[PDB]
């Protein structure tokens, strides 16, 4: 999309995958992350890291479904349907 | 200090503290936080949120002692002694 930004759909495997969300989101991309392969404890760690990542850059965090969340950059205008489609 | 930065010392009581650490760090302040009064689960949540803040803004997370951590902004030159003094 315009201004070097896209939606990165990723599948998480463990807490080290916090860096995958981090790398893309810090570079101005929205990230839609699937936590289906994580334990509830691992998923809580990812969501807390993602909340930190989002707060630092004035982004928005949203829950797509039971296992999928998204981090959206500050000046981005991405609807839930677009994040849902990317998921 | 220069460019709207300081050291903010905080005794933490809950995960509600994440937005307080976040609010100050995102503006370029170093934050030194004592987690002695948190459960082990709450302390892990704070550290995961703080790792997300650090990643987003290229900051440094430093363990001061068993219960005290600090988040230092990217271009800040704060020693361990200064963070220890503020704690
Ligand atoms: Zn494009
Ligand atoms: Zn991995
Ligand atoms: Zn000052
Ligand atoms: Zn300041
Ligand atoms: Zn408190
Ligand atoms: Zn309590």
Author numbering:
A (entry chain A), B (entry chain B): 63 to 149
Quoted from the paper:
At the cell division site, FtsZ protofilaments form a highly dynamic, membrane-bound structure, the Z-ring, which serves as a scaffold for the recruitment of the extra-cytoplasmic cell wall biosynthetic machinery. Here we investigate the physiological function of Corynebacterium glutamicum SepF, the only cell division-associated protein from Actinobacteria known to interact with the conserved C-terminal tail of FtsZ. We found that FtsZ filaments and lipid membranes have opposing effects on SepF polymerization, pointing to a complex dynamic role of the protein at the division site, involving FtsZ bundling, Z-ring tethering and membrane reshaping activities that are needed for proper Z-ring assembly and function.
Helix α3 formation and stabilization were not due to FtsZ binding, because the crystal structure of unliganded SepFΔML revealed the same overall structure than FtsZCTD-bound SepFΔML (rmsd of 0.83 Å for 160 equivalent Cα atoms in the homodimer), indicating that peptide binding produced no significant conformational changes. The presence of this helix has important functional implications as it caps the β-sheet that was previously described as the dimerization interface of B. subtilis SepF11. If the functional SepF unit is conserved, the β-sheet-mediated interface observed in B. subtilis SepF crystals could therefore mediate protein polymerization in solution. This interface, which was also seen in SepF-like proteins from Pyrococcus furiosus and Archaeoglobus fulgidus, is precluded in the C. glutamicum SepF structure by the presence of the C-terminal helix α3. However, inspection of the unliganded SepFΔML structure revealed that this helix displays considerably higher B-factor values than the rest of the protein and a similar trend is also observed in the SepFΔML–FtsZCTD complex, suggesting that helix α3 could play a regulatory role on SepF polymerization by uncovering the outer face of the β-sheet for intermolecular interactions.
